[PDB]
Curated annotation (Swiss-Prot), chain C:
Belongs to the V-ATPase E subunit family. Produces ATP from ADP in the presence of a proton gradient across the membrane. This is V-type ATP synthase subunit E. It comes from Thermus thermophilus (strain ATCC 27634 / DSM 579 / HB8). The lineage of its organism: Bacteria, Thermotogati, Deinococcota, Deinococci, Thermales.
Length: 40, 632, 62
């Protein structure tokens, strides 16, 4: 046991999932813009 | 199946977690825990896994159940794959088939039991009843009574009915079957007469009883006749079923067992990172390396020879780090000779211990429960017999030496080399054990003592080492003071042992010897200062047990002087075969007790071992009854 | 380590299924708008076209 190594590595992963979600929600914000523009 | 890697699980004492971890870590293992206090970096518990668990339990249980009703039960074995679903499917037809027959068997037995019992009253009652059981138009009450009740029912009947009834009885064994017959109009009164009498309507459960006697009687005859034949046929099917399919069950069953544990283990790692052991999940490549580097310790679930064998198991606790003190591994040569030399005897005894041994590592098939012991058959399981092959030999070795100490003993039991009486008594050799000379006895007494004095040393050195190497001043002080104690014992003893050998060589040194004692006991201060009496009792205990080892020994020997030598008749050459009548019975009782005597050693050792003299067990504690360890 | 490798490798393969999903959840929006829009410009060709032909006819008929 060396606590930090595995108890921090498990965090790094979460922030890669997190980063996916962010990069995702923008695509929705992209289609929302586009949804307005093309009709307007 | 549990992860894409397959788990290997190992456990042992608290000390091994770290060593187990280092060898495993190196092997190429992945998803490793124990490790740190909040690890969850692999895989965790989920509904599905639990569901699967439930399913495995069903599989396990069903096999067990079917085997139980069927008869015999399965061994453990190594897993044989077959899909979980497949397994579930497999289990189904067989349990069902077996179960149906199980029911049938019970039913047949039940039919017979009632049918035999009831058959005799029913034919007898029917015969009496006959002519009313074509269609009751007269109403009838059957009942059985033996001799005593018989006036009581009649008197009751007479008052109520008058004499308009027919009362009949005949004996047939099982009392006498009695009938009351009345008109269908008198029925109410007739029964009322019975209520007083205390006898009442004989009944058969179900349809048959209500149906008059003749119909019922016929029905009992067909069932009685039918059931034994039917039972045979089904039972035979069951026997067949066992022979072939028991095998199927066993392999499935076993597979289920390993799976259940494996999953459970997994649940334990997931959540809260396990306790003390060490697990991990192993790719097939890692799997040989893990078996390879082990330092003699762990217990896993995957998915000269006498001297070496127990020595190899004490070694795992030799490698355990938990103190700088020593373990009880040296124990084996102090125990082993002596244990054998516990056996003492001659022609009628020790020199016959050979036979006993020959049945252990062997057997003789004249022995009702030592049938084929090489393949193990006993009044306890065959498996136990197979396992304790290791033991059967260690006992056999005991027998080989015990016979030998029969001649060791028998050196001082005969000759014209040293005792001025005959070379071997001509009736039977050995007739009078010659040791009753003060001196002859004394040397054997003091001899026994000596192996014990050394044992006192063995403990207190180790003991002092616990406190030395941990810096427990308390353990150091204990060990040291007790060696001070030894000095005073030796002073007094000499003054009686030669009487005048010392006792003023060391009996005036004695004034200063008491000083050698008390130096470090007072340094611990101690509140249980008195306990030093009992510590003197330990020096003496080694002597005392050893003394008993002599005396009880001798006692054993004195029975051949009446039990094989001579005790009946003035003296003849027929005395040989006159004496065996009592001798032989008494022999086994005698035999038994010396088995008890060999436990005196272990206790002797245990005085030191289980009581911390540089040792783990202290009135129990972790570390396990060592007796049971060295035995193999 | 290779241990931490498996956790990386899993997380990334999951990440890409979210991102592609995210694109599709957008894509349908994007393409919905397009489809809706087509129906707006066309439907207004229709009404106005009638307001043409019929206008001239009655004018001639007058």
């Amino acid at each position: 046991g060396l606590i930090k190594s595995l108890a921090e590595k498990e965090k790094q992963l979460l922030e890669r999932l997190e980063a996916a979600k962010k990069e995702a929600e923008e695509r929705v914000k992209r289609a929302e813009a586009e949804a307005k523009a093309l009709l307007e | 199946m549990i992860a894409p890697m397959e788990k290997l699980v190992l456990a042992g004492p608290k000390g091994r977690a770290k060593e187990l971890l280092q060898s495993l870590q190196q092997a190429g293992v992945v998803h490793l825990e124990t490790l740190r206090p909040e690890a969850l970096s692999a895989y965790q518990l989920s509904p599905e896994e639990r569901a699967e668990l439930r399913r495995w339990e069903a599989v396990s249980a069903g096999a067990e159940h079917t085997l139980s009703l069927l008869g015999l039960e399965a061994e453990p074995a190594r897993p044989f794959p077959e899909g979980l679903e497949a397994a579930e499917k497999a289990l189904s037809p067989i349990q069902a088939h077996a179960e149906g027959l199980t029911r049938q068997k019970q039913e047949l037995e039940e039919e017979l039991a009632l049918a035999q019992a009831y058959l005799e009253p029913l034919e007898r009652l029917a015969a009496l009843a006959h002519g009313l059981d074509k269609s009751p138009f007269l109403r009838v009450i059957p009942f059985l009574l033996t001799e005593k009740e018989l006036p009581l029912v009649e008197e009751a009947l007479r008052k109520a009915l008058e004499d308009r009834y027919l009362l009949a009885h005949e004996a047939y064994a099982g009392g006498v079957a009695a009938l009351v017959v009345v008109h269908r109009k008198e029925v109410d009164q007739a029964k009322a007469a019975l209520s007083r009498a205390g006898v009442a309507e004989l009944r058969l459960p179900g349809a048959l009883g209500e149906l008059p006697l003749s119909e019922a009687a016929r029905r009992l005859k067909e069932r009685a006749e039918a059931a034994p034949r039917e039972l045979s046929e089904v039972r035979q099917h069951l026997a067949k079923l066992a022979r072939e399919s028991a095998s199927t069950l066993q392999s499935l069953w076993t597979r289920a067992q390993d799976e259940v544990a494996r999953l459970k283990a997994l649940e334990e790692l997931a959540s809260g990172r396990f306790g003390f052991a060490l697990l991990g999940y192993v790719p097939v490549k890692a799997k040989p390396k893990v078996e390879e580097a082990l330092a003699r310790h762990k217990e896993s679930v995957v998915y000269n020879p006498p001297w070496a064998k127990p020595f190899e198991l004490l070694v795992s606790f030799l490698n355990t780090p938990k103190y700088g003190t020593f373990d009880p591994t040296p124990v084996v040569p102090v125990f082993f000779p002596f244990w054998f030399g516990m056996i003492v005897g001659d022609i009628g005894y020790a020199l016959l211990f050979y036979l006993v041994g020959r049945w252990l590592s062997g057997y003789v098939k004249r022995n009702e429960p030592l049938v084929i012991d090489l393949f193990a058959l006993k009044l306890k399981p065959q498996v136990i017999g197979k396992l304790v092959h290791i033991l059967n030999w260690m006992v056999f070795w005991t027998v080989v030496w015990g016979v030998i100490y029969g001649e060791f003993f028998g050196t001082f039991l005969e000759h014209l080399g040293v005792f001025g009486t005959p070379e071997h008594p001509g009736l039977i050799p050995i007739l009078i054990h010659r040791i009753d000379t003060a001196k002859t006895a004394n040397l054997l007494i003091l001899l026994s003592v000596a192996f014990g004095v050394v044992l006192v040393f063995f403990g207190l050195a180790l003991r002092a080492y616990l406190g030395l190497k941990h810096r427990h001043m308390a353990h150091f002080w204990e060990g040291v003071g007790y060696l001070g104690g030894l000095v005073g014992v030796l002073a007094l003893a000499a003054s009686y042992l030669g009487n005048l050998q010392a006792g003023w060589l060391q009996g005036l040194m004695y004034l200063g010897f008491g000083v050698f004692l008390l130096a470090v006991l007072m340094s611990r201060i101690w509140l249980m200062i008195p306990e030093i009496f009992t510590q003197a009792g330990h020096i003496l205990s080694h002597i005392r047990i050893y003394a008993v080892g002599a005396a009880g020994g001798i006692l054993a020997g004195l029975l051949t002087d009446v039990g094989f030598a001579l005790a009946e008749r003035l003296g003849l050459l027929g005395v040989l075969l006159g004496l065996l009548v009592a001798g032989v019975l008494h022999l086994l009782i005698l035999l038994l007790t010396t088995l008890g005597h060999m436990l005196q050693p272990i206790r002797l050792l245990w005085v030191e071992f289980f009581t911390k003299f540089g040792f783990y067990e202290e009135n129990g504690r972790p570390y396990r009854p060592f007796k049971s360890v060295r035995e193999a | 380590s290779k241990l931490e490798a498996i956790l990386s490798q899993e997380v990334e393969a999951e990440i890409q299924a979210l991102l592609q999903e995210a694109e599709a959840k957008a894509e349908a929006v994007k393409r919905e708008a397009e489809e809706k829009a087509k129906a707006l410009l066309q439907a207004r060709e229709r009404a106005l076209e009638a307001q043409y032909r019929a206008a001239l006819r009655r004018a001639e008929s007058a």
